[PDB]
Structure formats: C-alpha cells, structure tokens
Amino acid sequence: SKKGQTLMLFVGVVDPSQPDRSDIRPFTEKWTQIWQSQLYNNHVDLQVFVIDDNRAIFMFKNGEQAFEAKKFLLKQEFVSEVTIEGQSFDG
Amino acid sequence: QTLMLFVGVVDPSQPDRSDIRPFTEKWTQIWQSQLYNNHVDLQVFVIDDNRAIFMFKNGEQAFEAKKFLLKQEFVSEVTIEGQSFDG
Ligand SMILES: [Cl-]
Ligand SMILES: [Cl-]
Ligand SMILES: [Cl-]
Ligand SMILES: [Cl-]
Numbered sequence: 001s002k003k004g005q006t007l008m009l010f011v012g013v014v015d016p017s018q019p020d021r022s023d024i025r026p027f028t029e030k031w032t033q034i035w036q037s038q039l040y041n042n043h044v045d046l047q048v049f050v051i052d053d054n055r056a057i058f059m060f061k062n063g064e065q066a067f068e069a070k071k072f073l074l075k076q077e078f079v080s081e082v083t084i085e086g087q088s089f090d091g
Numbered sequence: 092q093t094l095m096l097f098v099g100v101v102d103p104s105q106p107d108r109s110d111i112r113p114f115t116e117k118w119t120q121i122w123q124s125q126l127y128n129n130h131v132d133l134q135v136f137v138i139d140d141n142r143a144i145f146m147f148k149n150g151e152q153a154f155e156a157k158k159f160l161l162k163q164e165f166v167s168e169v170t171i172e173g174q175s176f177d178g
Contacts, residue, residue, distance in 0.1 A: 006146065008136065045176045049097075051138055061176045087134040088116075088143070091123050 005086055007063035011035075011056045011073055012080035025053040031078050032056045044069050054080075093174040094153035095146040097138075098160060099167035112140040118165050119143045126156055141167075146174075 013028040015021060032048050036058070039046060045061040046069065060066055066084045073079045100115045102108065119135050123145070126133060131152045136144040145160075147153040153171055160166045 006134065006136075010138075040177065045178060047174065047176055049172070051142070057138065057144075059174070085136060088137045089120055089123060089135055091127065091132055091134045 002061065002063075004063045007060055007066045007084055007086050009058040009060075009066060009069060009073070010081075010083045010085065011058055012082070013054045013056070013078050014080040015078065023053045025050065027078070028054055028056060031076075032058075035073060035076060035079075039069055039072060042068070042072065044072075092150045093146060093148050094150040095144050095172050095174065096153055096157055096160065097168075097170045097172065098143050098145055099169070100141045100143070100165055101167040102165065109139070109141045112137075114165075115141055115143065118163075119145075122160065122163070126159065131156055150174075 011032065013024065013031060015024050015027050029050055032050060036046060036048050044065045046058045049057045051057055058069060070082045070084055073082045100118060102111045102114045105111055115137060119137065123133060123135055133145045133147050133156065138144055145156060157169050157171055160169045
C-alpha cells in the first residue's frame with residue numbers, strides 16, 4: 001500500500017545533436033532507463049512508460065519524491081522538459 | 092496489484108485528428124462517472140490530447156472497465172498494464 005496521492009512526471013527528451021527531431025525513440029528508451037537507474041540508486045523507485053518517441057511518464061512508488069526526481073532530471077543534458085501531474089478529476 | 096488502462100480516444104466527427112482535448116476531457120469524465128455509478132472507482136490521468144490512463148487501485152476492476160471501454164464508439168484502443176516497481 002502507498003502513502004499519499006499518485007503523482008507522475010512527464011519527461012521530454014531532446015537529442016542536442018539532432019534538436020528538431022522528434023522521432024528519437026531509441027534515444028528516449030536508452031536515456032529514460034538510465035535516468036531510472038540513477039534515480040533508483042538515489043532511492044527513488046519509479047516505473048517508466050515511453051508514451052511518445054520523445055516523451056515518457058515516470059510513475060512514482062512514493063509521490064513525495066516527485067520533486068526530487070524533477071530536480072534531478074532537469075540537471076540532465078537530454079531532458080527538454082519535466083512536468084508533474086496528479087489525477088485529472090476527483091475519482 | 093494496481094492495474095491501469097491506456098485509453099485512446101477518437102472523435103469520429105473529427106477523423107484523423109489528435110488535437111481533441113475538450114472531447115477527451117469530456118468523455119473520460121463521463122466514462123469515469125458511469126463506471127463509478129456501477130461501483131468501479133478509478134483515477135484518470137490525461138496524457139495527451141487524445142489519450143488517458145485509467146488507474147484501478149482495486150486492480151481487478153480494470154478488466155471490467157476494459158470490456159466496457161472497448162465497446163465505446165469513441166475509444167480507439169485500450170491496453171492493460173500492471174503497476175510494477177523493479178526491486
Ligand atoms: Cl548511479
Ligand atoms: Cl519500469
Ligand atoms: Cl510542473
Ligand atoms: Cl480522477
């Protein structure tokens with residue numbers, strides 16, 4: 001069982017070597033898994049879903065850690081943006 | 092185990108358009124409400140202008156919802172995933 005509401009991140013990826021290119025799925029898959037590993041080693045457990053060729057969702061086991069994860073991701077070269085969202089309605 | 096559904100939405104009156112956020116927001120709310128009136132509680136996370144995640148913390152209810160959603164005119168696709176953290 002979890003403590004707290006469910007939060008996730010959306011994480012955009014840009015390859016600076018090809019900056020206007022959105023169809024970079026291999027690169028997004030590579031780097032999101034690396035970031036997941038680095039976050040795991042900082043004691044932040046999350047599940048990754050690659051939902052576009054250049055965008056992924058990180059779902060947290062503990063939503064309290066969403067800000068630590070956003071802060072980490074925004075330090076990474078290939079992260080273009082990061083937003084945090086909770087549930088859309090009231091269910 | 093918590094289960095979730097990835098739900099794709101299509102507006103047949105705006106065929107081949109993904110920029111249908113108002114329609115997606117309306118219909119995901121309606122489906123959530125209809126399921127709640129039959130005792131299935133879920134949370135919606137809208138993830139694109141035509142896609143949402145429905146999360147079922149009573150996990151088994153996800154298969155009931157999947158059956159309900161796949162027969163909706165405005166649902167293009169529904170896939171089911173389990174919540175799982177490496178460890
Ligand atoms: Cl590391
Ligand atoms: Cl994962
Ligand atoms: Cl944000
Ligand atoms: Cl909700």
